[PDB]
């Protein structure tokens, strides 16, 4: 594969999970549409990454 | 089975593999039968993916070399239809059983390699993969017919079909079985 997520993703991912904690599922598609609506995302492809990491954080935080 | 595909004339059942070390690297009858040896194919992008495509297809692929026969895979299938035809008439065996024997008898079992020590040539004998045996064995017998028809009245079809008889038998009157034992003769020495 290759590819480790950049700092722009991991930095903003933390903010977005913190303040809208109770607005996340554990599904990709729901968490995608939420990020588009609660905040500006300057691209679509960038959104699809940041959502997926926000999802991955939300799995562990309930443990 | 009630829809069993031939080659348009040849059974893909009654085909034996006489090794347990080379079965499931020969592909000929699990469901690998087809009427032609032409496909789009996937032979790449994963290492274990070459062994999943037919032996007959592999044969067509490996005999199209020398810079003027590349991109002429269709001409190559012409040579294969005559080859099997001649093999079946000539001895009487189903000509796929011929090919499988020819592969099994021609594969080298030990080979040498290089090692740098003290600034002088030393050699080491090593073994071989089953996947290596198949790749080598397909190359070697095809080299014979390619060489033979390079200034002869005999056509490439005739040469290739002759070479599979002498390979399938233990005769040792072929370009393949000669060179097979040459390699092993080295491997004994620098063992």
């Amino acid at each position: 594969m290759g590819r480790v997520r950049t700092k722009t993703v991991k930095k903003a991912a933390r903010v977005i999970i913190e303040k809208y904690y109770t607005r996340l599922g554990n599904d990709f598609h729901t968490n995608k549409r939420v990020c588009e609506e609660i905040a500006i995302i300057p691209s679509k492809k960038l959104r699809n990454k940041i959502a997926g990491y926000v999802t991955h954080l939300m799995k562990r935080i309930q443990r | 089975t009630p829809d069993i595909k031939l080659f348009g004339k040849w059974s893909t059942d009654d085909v034996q593999i006489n090794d347990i070390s080379l079965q499931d690297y020969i592909a000929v009858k699990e469901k690998y039968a087809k009427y032609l040896p032409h496909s789009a194919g996937r032979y790449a992008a994963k290492r274990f993916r070459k062994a999943q495509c037919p032996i007959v297809e592999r044969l067509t692929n490996s005999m199209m070399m020398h810079g003027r026969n590349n991109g002429k895979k269709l001409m190559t299938v012409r040579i294969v239809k005559h080859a099997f035809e001649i093999i079946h008439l000539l001895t009487g065996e189903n000509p796929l059983q011929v090919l499988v024997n020819a592969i099994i008898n021609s594969g080298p079992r030990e080979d040498s390699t290089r090692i740098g020590r003290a600034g002088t040539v030393r050699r080491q004998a090593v073994d071989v993969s089953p996947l290596r045996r198949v790749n080598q064995a397909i190359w070697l017998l095809c080299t014979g017919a390619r060489e033979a028809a390079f200034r002869n009245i005999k056509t490439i079809a005739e040469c290739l079909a002759d070479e599979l008889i002498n390979a399938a038998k233990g005769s040792s009157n072929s370009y393949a079985i000669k060179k097979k034992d040459e390699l092993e003769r080295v491997a004994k020495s620098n063992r």
């Binding site: - | 469901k31 087809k34 496909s39 789009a40 269709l74």
Partner: protein
């Protein structure tokens, strides 16, 4: 000549499948789909691969002209 043969084969195969899914029933085409995909040869999907562009400094899309030192 070659690529046309694969196109017409792929179309008539797919035609048959679609026809049964739409005017007959699901279980009609489900059998037939299973038969084809067993000996799959891109009989229900399209090959992605297409030619890659030539970029300068060599013939072809990946080969390079000879380079001589001295």
């Amino acid at each position: 000549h070659v690529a046309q043969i694969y196109a017409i084969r792929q179309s008539i195969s797919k035609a048959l499948v679609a026809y049964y899914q739409k005017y007959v029933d699901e279980a009609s085409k489900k059998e037939i789909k299973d038969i084809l995909i067993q000996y799959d040869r891109t009989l229900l999907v399209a090959d992605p691969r297409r030619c890659e562009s030539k970029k300068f400094g060599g013939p072809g899309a990946r080969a390079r002209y000879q380079k001589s030192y001295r």
